[PDB]
Symmetry: C4
Subunit: 457 residues, 4 copies
């Protein structure tokens, strides 16, 4: 008899790919919460007079600040097991910015041969990153019976930046959720005294990389728990293969139908018709669904890599799982359109979206003109129109009424400075928002309003 | 003759249940304002270097901070009647974390037998909450003629957390609004030095429970004022019983009508008539009324409990009063529809809401796909997409233009770190907002626009 | 011949009343900017460790803070001509909280006879404001040859509050805009150490009243400049009288028309005219004009009072000018409707506003139900639903997407504390905003959309 | 044969003028980022106890603060090469506020002859800016073998303000992007201790001008890189001239058509052609193109001046480039209307915009009435309605739900102070937003909704 829709096991991916995403995501989130709080700790340890909030605003301006910051950072490394809580340990380094038997490396980056003097110009600056590094590594015990890191000179005129390199091995003690011996961590701190500007302002930033592995243990019943999350991706590879195999057969019927439309008896209408509706001939939504497959499966293999080998980078695969989850979950709509009544409500979008897109091109075209205009006029005077990304962000957030009073307040502060710019910004912001709220959005509403009107008749 | 609508004494609940809610709410609000300001006081007393604002950001990072915080907390307990204003007194405790004759109890929670060491792994951690508590309680007078709380070691490597337990009895002197002798209070402070992460960051949080009772007094004319607010709930129980009794009789006529629709002469068309009409044949107004009722009456009994006995917990009953007040106040609309003209304006909603809900399922379906996608990609790099509750909160607040520039500003800060994530977030946020403002909301408007168009014809 | 519209001199009020408002407003604004910056100065002078921002958060918690705050305030009064800039002088007081020959008066407000003790209750508190005031006033010169304000005890158990009363005479040196000798000022500072709670938190607030007058000067050409702003209100009284006289004659024709419907020949159609339509035939535009008028004229007389003697109440008159300016400026629309095309665009509002108001009653009715519900549930746990004004403010601002993420962030902070309240607030906020954005606003749009549709046919 | 649209080389300006804008903008932005960070540096150097954030809130209140601020500023100038990083040098001044051989000039501005005293009025203030300046300039080397800037008296009663004038020459070391010897800079700092109020609050503000030039160097291959960006404006002048020449010939045909419409045979219908339609005949596209043109060309000449000449001021030319880029980019729409389908979507705007503008006049008219009303009532009590620019900003940002809860929170703070003002502001804000969201915006939507309805029929 009539067997049911065995092809509709795409519902399995609605859970499986989402659970693959949430299993990964809940573990990966939990790692970051540990990762960042450590970087918060290192800022409280290694930065001289750091505060919870000032990151971009935290910086050196005098020379004694820069010295005392560096020495404060170093002396806080030297006494890490003494004063700092959490229990870290020194790397004992064998890498590039550390010598064969060194741990903390404060490293200048300054010009090779050069000179700077206004009103008496005689110099020959030859741009170069001549890095001088001072090594230091203290032992754990008190000093046994058997130097110049303090005797250190920056050359501030000549100084690009100062980088304090070190790594801290550590044991993530949120492992007791697994209930056995822990998984092992290694932070890679970089205290950067950045002076690329030479403007008398030196951002102090402490930033870390994380490297994770499993360190020696002979105990029992930890190794089995890892395999359950490892095995679940094979369900994803099993579903993905089935989905990838299933759309292509539907495409085969596409290619068959291509023939059969003319093919029962050829010359339906002479020759060579381009059949623009036929150019949307295959029901491609399932190919779009299967392509979201390819990003899921390409995601999982790359996630299995990052898990199963020393590969440590969560960017592309993290996008590919999310994009695929999103692009599967948007696909639940075209699963939902097998219902009759719901299909009318979604068909309104699929009859309007050409018109809405065809209008949106015009709005984007104006919006860009505004993004350019405000950028060069309000880039000098105001923070929130500095770069074209930030102008577009601030404007595109300003269309919905976010930080509008906060922008308009920045204008008044520059009313004493160039009233033409203030009055220009008043006229500019008003003309931007009034157009985009009462004429654009209104028309975006009008197109779909008219679509919903036209579709039922 | 024709007696009036005596069944329309539901108007009584519009005041009575609202007044029950406001009488309770104004007294309960007034208690919290006292409750919290005391917790603000205890943070200024018992926390070493606490500031008005930093609660989540307030934490220890070095070991001398943790010591000095604990000792500062203890020495501020020891000298509470000395230095602190407001007039408290010590509990003189006979509970669980205090011994038979103790007051302040600083209490470690640390591992039983265990060890931690990177690059030389030999340990056997056996997860346990071996709590060591140090008791202390000072007398009021100066020391008469007839120890090691300072001689205290944390074991930071081993430390889960440190909890300082105490209670403070106190007299709420906002009782003079009643005009007689006061009602009596007891706070239950818990200073938590939480280190479940072992990330070198230890949140310091001081949190209190409140226990209220009436302490000895022989004076006159306080006991009568309490009874007036006690008696008013009996009006609620009186109205509620009448409302619960009145709906069920209307439902009886429902059950009778079931028979009588076919029952004047059976087989109108066999048994053909879709009992969907039966689903709309009983008036659901009365079910809305009873849903209000049961929450009001369940509210009141639980409110009478919290008032009349040692029960001190304002959660469920506080929801049940509010839900019932809300669900009565939404019911004023279907009281309001006995008017003819108003009924057309509300009938637009009751003809559209099926379509609006049937569309909303599709929007929620996409929105979830976005909630997943942004969560794993923007969970590591950004604060505002950390967990799926916060992603949904931030997105669902971001659809209306709240903190959009503040999210887009968090993106730029992570533009140096993984440009693919920045450019992904730019494309992600834009695609989220542009869809949800110009195509979704517009269609939500279109459905009701078309409903209002269709209803009058 | 046909004389023009001499009755249309209402255009004169569009300038005159606006100029009366701006002349007043620019002078009154300029006074406040001086008034407040002085209160900022006094906070930096007289408050111990005050910061630019903390006003509500600025408070005492220990007893030594309260002492040192008061003594710091007093010693900053004692040395005002020494250390403070701006040039003030002492009042030399002859008022109520100062003795006949005193200046600074620190004044307790504490209970008469009473006692407070938990767990050993024996007291007889007799609510009273027994105020003890300590007087002090230093001379300008160094001490010539010819006490216990430091020897002062608060009784903290007994203490309601401590108020430091003083006044500072001063010369507003922004008078040189007038170009002659200055107008003279007197501030009235009140440092309040408020402890009505007895919760160990004592808000420290410094607040001032301003009293202005003209102090001795024999010079020439200052007195003429005041008369020009004085005379301009007589133009307002001249226009107002003409407008008030003009409407009433139009109302006379109203009263005549009331008669004359039946009055050409009685029994026109029996009693078939309902007369309520006649109540909505007559033009309220002149009543709108008179409502503007009476507020303008009542404004001016009260402004002429404050100017021409005794000087110290704005509030009501300041509302009456603004309300009248607003209510005149809204009247420019019904001046604007003498045009034909514009009248169609405003007639859409005057055919829809009954329906919009008739719907709005239902929305407000739900909105109130939400305002009650959220108040008692989210009053304890959250700051932004504390009182029904603030609930309504936060909700009614939350309908447009203001501080929504900031409310939703307050929820997560109370997720550990009573998950039912968190999950309730999640469901509550969502249900509030989703209803009010996609179903309410959409219908508000639908009514006017349909009005604009229906009006042209 | 038929040659193509050679007149459509306006597409060249879409890139050329945009690239002219971005080339300029990316270089000009990069200069400001250097310019401002230096002003951040000078605030950290020359201001006593300055913080990252407090600019408007940063100010002096006592006299010892003002002294120590000035002396701190001076002693930080005196030791600039000692302590400050970034490498500056002293001007060695020959300008107006410096003597022939001076560098740092602290300069009072105080009254000539005058006196101030309340309650004993005898004075003759004669408004004058009698400036006393104290000169100082230290040498680079230690003091060789071969005064009263500390022995300095302000006269605070008499003091308008104190200005510390100096300039710092500096070498912008972000020149290595060009890869050769740097371009040379000169900052012009002004530390202003502003006391125009005499309210005991003295804003301390440090502000700089920038003067750039090229200082001596004999090296090779820097001079060629400048010429490439110089030459690219000649492409703008080349395109602009062609565009300006092309429109005017199209206008000639305009003037010719005027004649030719009646002119094949005049008296087409008696007197009629009526001519008013001819008054509304002429095609604006080319005027929009020329309005872009003139601003581009006027921009470029002034940009060539500003860079290559006595380089002075980035205001007008910066507006003219942006306005021209914007006004060209809006012109891409009327290039886009040569398509048939797109023209219907833009024609909706060009049939509605008269009606939308004709309505907007009424909304603006009410909005102004609100802007006046709120200004005088909420100017004293609240920060966000201080001046009519800020009232309009706050209201016009408040229509979209920006800082609404933040305004409504400012109301509650003034609920104790004049409840009539609080309750007035509650009623005011509600009446403002409820009108402007549900009746105005809704009608703005309705007009375009109806336009889109009417256009297709």
């Amino acid at each position: 008899g009539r067997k049911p829709c065995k092809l509709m096991l795409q519902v399995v991916k609605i859970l499986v790919v989402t659970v693959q995403l949430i299993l990964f995501g809940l573990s990966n989130q939990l790692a970051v919460t540990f990762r960042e709080e450590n970087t918060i700790a290192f800022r409280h340890l290694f930065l001289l007079g750091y505060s919870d909030g000032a990151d971009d605003t935290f910086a050196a301006y005098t020379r004694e600040q820069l010295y005392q910051a560096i020495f404060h950072a170093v002396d806080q490394y030297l006494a890490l097991p003494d004063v700092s809580l959490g229990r870290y340990a020194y790397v004992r380094g064998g890498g590039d910015p550390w010598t064969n038997g060194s741990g903390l490396a404060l490293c200048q980056r300054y010009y090779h041969r050069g000179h700077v003097d206004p009103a008496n110009d005689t110099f020959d600056i030859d741009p170069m990153v001549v890095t001088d590094c001072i090594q230091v590594d203290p032992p754990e015990r008190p000093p046994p019976p058997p130097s110049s890191y303090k005797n250190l000179t920056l050359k501030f005129h000549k100084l690009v930046n100062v980088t304090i390199h070190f790594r801290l091995k550590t044991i993530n003690l949120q492992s007791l959720i697994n209930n056995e011996i822990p998984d092992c961590y290694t932070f890679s701190v970089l205290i950067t005294f950045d002076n690329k500007a030479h403007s008398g302002r030196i951002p102090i930033s402490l930033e870390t990389q994380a490297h994770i592995q499993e360190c020696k243990h002979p105990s029992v019943f930890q190794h089995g728990d890892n395999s359950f999350r490892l095995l679940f991706d094979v369900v994803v590879i099993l579903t993905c293969s089935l989905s990838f195999l299933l759309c292509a057969r539907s495409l085969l019927r596409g290619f068959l139908l291509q023939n059969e439309f003319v093919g029962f008896m050829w010359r339906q209408r002479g020759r060579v018709i381009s059949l623009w509706e036929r150019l949307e001939f295959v029901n491609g939504w399932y190919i779009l669904l299967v392509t979201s497959d390819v990003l899921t499966i390409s995601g999982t293999i790359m996630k299995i890599g990052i898990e199963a080998k020393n590969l440590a980078s969560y960017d592309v695969c993290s996008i590919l799982l999310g994009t695929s989850t999103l692009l599967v979950w948007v696909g639940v709509i075209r699963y939902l359109t097998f219902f009759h009544n719901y299909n009318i409500l979604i068909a309104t979008l699929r009859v309007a979206l050409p018109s809405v897109m065809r209008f949106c091109c015009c709005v984007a075209v104006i919006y860009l003109g505004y993004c350019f205009c405000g950028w060069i006029v309000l880039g000098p005077y105001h923070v929130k129109f500095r770069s074209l990304s930030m102008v577009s962000e601030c404007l595109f957030s300003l269309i919905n009424g976010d930080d509008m009073f906060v922008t308009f307040a920045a204008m008044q502060a520059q009313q004493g400075r160039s009233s033409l710019v203030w009055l220009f910004s008043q006229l500019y912001l008003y003309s931007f928002i009034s157009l985009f709220i009462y004429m654009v959005l209104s028309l975006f509403i009008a197109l779909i309003t008219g679509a919903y009107d036209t579709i039922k008749h």
